[PDB]
Amino acid sequence: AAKDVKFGNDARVKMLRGVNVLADAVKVTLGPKGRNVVLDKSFGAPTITKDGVSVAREIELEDKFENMGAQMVKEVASKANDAAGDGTTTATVLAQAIITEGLKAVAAGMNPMDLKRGIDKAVTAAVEELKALSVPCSDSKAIAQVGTISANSDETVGKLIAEAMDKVGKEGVITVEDGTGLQDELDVVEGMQFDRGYLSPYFINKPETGAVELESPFILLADKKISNIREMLPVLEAVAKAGKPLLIIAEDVEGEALATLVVNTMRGIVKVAAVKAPGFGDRRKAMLQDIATLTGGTVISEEIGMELEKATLEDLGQAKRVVINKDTTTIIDGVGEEAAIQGRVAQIRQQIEEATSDYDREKLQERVAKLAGGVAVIKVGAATEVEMKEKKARVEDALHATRAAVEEGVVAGGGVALIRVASKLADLRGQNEDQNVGIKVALRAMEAPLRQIVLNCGEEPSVVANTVKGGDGNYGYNAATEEYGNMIDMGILDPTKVTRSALQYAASVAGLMITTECMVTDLPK
Template identity: 50%
Template sequence: MFGVEARALMLEGVNELADAVQVTMGPKGRNVVIELSYGTPKITKDGVTVARSMAFENRVKNVGAALVKQVANATNAVAGDGTTLATVLARSIFAEGTKSVAAGMNAMDLRRGMNMAVDTVVEYLKSKAKTISTPTEYAQVASISANGDAEVGDLVAKALEKVGKEGVITISEGKTLENELEVIDGLKLDRGYLLTNFITNTRTQKCELDDPLILVHEKKISEASKLKPLLQLVVKLQRPLFIVADDVVGEALTALVVNKVRAGLKVCVIKAPGFGSYRIDHLLDFVALTGSKLISESTSLKLEDVTVEMLGNAKKIIVTKDDTIILGAVGDKQVIQERRDEVTSQLKKATAKFDKEKLEQRLSRLSGGVAVIKVGGASDVEISEKKDRVVDALNSARAAAYEGIVPGGGVALLQASRELDKIKTTNFEEKVGVQIIQIAMKIPAYIIAANAGYEASMVVGKLLEKIENDSFGFDAAQGEYVDMFKAGIVDPVKVLRRAIQDAVSVSTLLTTTEAVVYPNYTSNSNSNLHYN
């Protein structure tokens, strides 16, 4: 399929996708109900969740929608929020670009103009960014991202205050009606005890070790004879023993259980976290945090030669069947900082999403502190919907910590649109490309006002009249014109920047598309694959 016909069908798919996504935008955005292939339907206000759930029978429409889904996914992957914004911007840019190409304009010149405009918008946003550091500011950013839920904003702000922006914050499903925040001052490993024999508290089904010695072994431990000197040492010191190893089996495992039962030795074993090449990285992080030495061939340290100096220390270790929490680990601060610097350097060079996630987890662990936000609700459907908003709120607050904030509600983009008048272009098509971005920058404020039930054209017109006032904006939740900073209505620059860049990247490709190739499986042939 070629030319105008191909672009028109792709635009249909983009329009239907954007229509479903944009209803979630703003403090008075609506829910979207998604039918799942199994279980109860999902209710959400999360733009990327809505986008991912949509597909079309028409293959060309599906191509257009799939590319805009890519915009939402890309923005979500980097900024963690802003997926709805990216989707509506992509639709606007593609729609206006398609009109211009249909009118006979040069698509490549249009693209150059759009890229010039985006660079100007990004530079403007960076120049107006306000750094944030207080819990109140974090709460404001998080609340906006959670569709105006102040409780969620406060919860996220408290979590960040406790563990820092690099700290571990996990979001789980709670068991009560209320949201809860649990802060663990320590290190959490996703590994539970090897045997229930190690349990010290039968009521809670946990193994709790106070002031333990910590052995970290890279390989599998199977020989009791090699373990004997270590057991004699910990019995002499009258301290519990915590072992992290690839595995403990056979005679060695039996020896530990027998010593616990007969000699009263408090001991617990977990398997080393991670897998493959990541396992050794996790172990090296762990030895740095606990002040232990890694027993392995690479360090030339042997199990049978272990001394107390090779063992790590912690104030308390709590092990359940699923995970381990180490409290008050005693590691050398300089060694920990060196590990942290090394991981930070690797993170800057990483390109694969999986590698980035693993490195971010390691950096969080080395930064110390674990916060768990437990999302409560009356039903699984309610908890799932709230959990989506909490995830967005956390990601948005973290994004704000890195690149700062600007007035929210689409105001910053409206202000940036005025800066585009200053761009000098070399031809008419480039100027039209700039104008396409200028139109797109007005769309978010329009949709937010419309979703709240107000006359959007009048709202946007009023905001443009007061454009010289950097913080003047419209509070769609209250229906009032306010100082956006004072009202706490703000957007993270990182989220806006990524949404704009990702939207333009895909939209310009769609605008410059002249043909669509897709497989056509004909009903009268089982062997031949035809292409249109």
């Protein structure tokens, strides 16, 4: 189709007007007291909301260029949120500020590549300083406060997350499902999680999750290197006869076996998800034995001398749910008899007092954690199905945020540590003075988040910024209570990973667009 082609600033101002309008609409919702926005409905009384994601979903511009600039900004904010979990409106504010400044600098006739270099290395140095500032978010209080701020001040969600992880542990998995009545319920069910996932994304029947999700499956358990589908065909027929999804745990699947597995799956014959055998060596065989006991399955290992041709439904493990991540797989409610699982746990424990090696110490700790802690299952109790989905979404958002905080730490929330680092990295410079200017652009733009928080709360952005500058460390300004103090004390915990990802993706999009010189779109007809 005939195309409208733009070059340089022609496209750039076109992008930037849409970006700025998008963020002008979004940033009013930043902070605990974001400004009201009435998303118009097709019918009836429209919906009033106060979060950046809600409005960002409801935006389209007649100007195709402004619209697509908004589309890239929304895309990059989504990229951040995937690696952040919150700060979505904060990510939008950062994106607008850095994008607008970078486009204005590009229009100033100065080097775009140097802008990108300065911005990127400044972001790397800021990530390093945040990691230095990153204190480990491990305590149940900090986890509760992370689930609080992530779910827009919901303490109970983070508190229950901390309880579930304490009950089950990291070697297990916490899963969220539909609640029965109106109250959530947590169950430490018989499951496990090992750090081996699907060998091919072709097996993913739930592409949104990035993990194969099978309900009440048959679980083949192989401690062996597999090369041919001829050995596997009777098992495929057996599983297809009962109409259950199929999960393979093998030491290796190679060549024709995997090829015909892919062929049979794309034909829809069998729902097959094949993963690596956890660990290596004898530990792998023992862990397969734990799986076999928990799911009522059996280990198919050549050391037994038994072949895969004669593998049947009882031989294959049975669970109620399995989730096969990229390099991780978890079993939820293994159908295998629970007292048998207890006997296997006692077997692993007697193996524990037989071993003494610290490597073996931690490996057996992991095994007993997987088998006994099982899987945390959360059933969200809510009244209306719309509130059911709302609450569940809050729950997984807080869960992802708590994982990010555990793995990256939490800095003081409210945007005050940003002011701290601005007081710190005010001296950062690049190889070219253009890189210096990009660094200073970043320093300016990165105080904007707190500024917009205070603005939407109805108070003074820059005055709060200056007063925080007067302080140091966690000294800052609760924009909800609007009080100066230690943000950690009043529970405003923004994880290191959240702001880190938001800033990194904002830098990525700003640099990429700074280096953009032409574009092609469709004609406005």
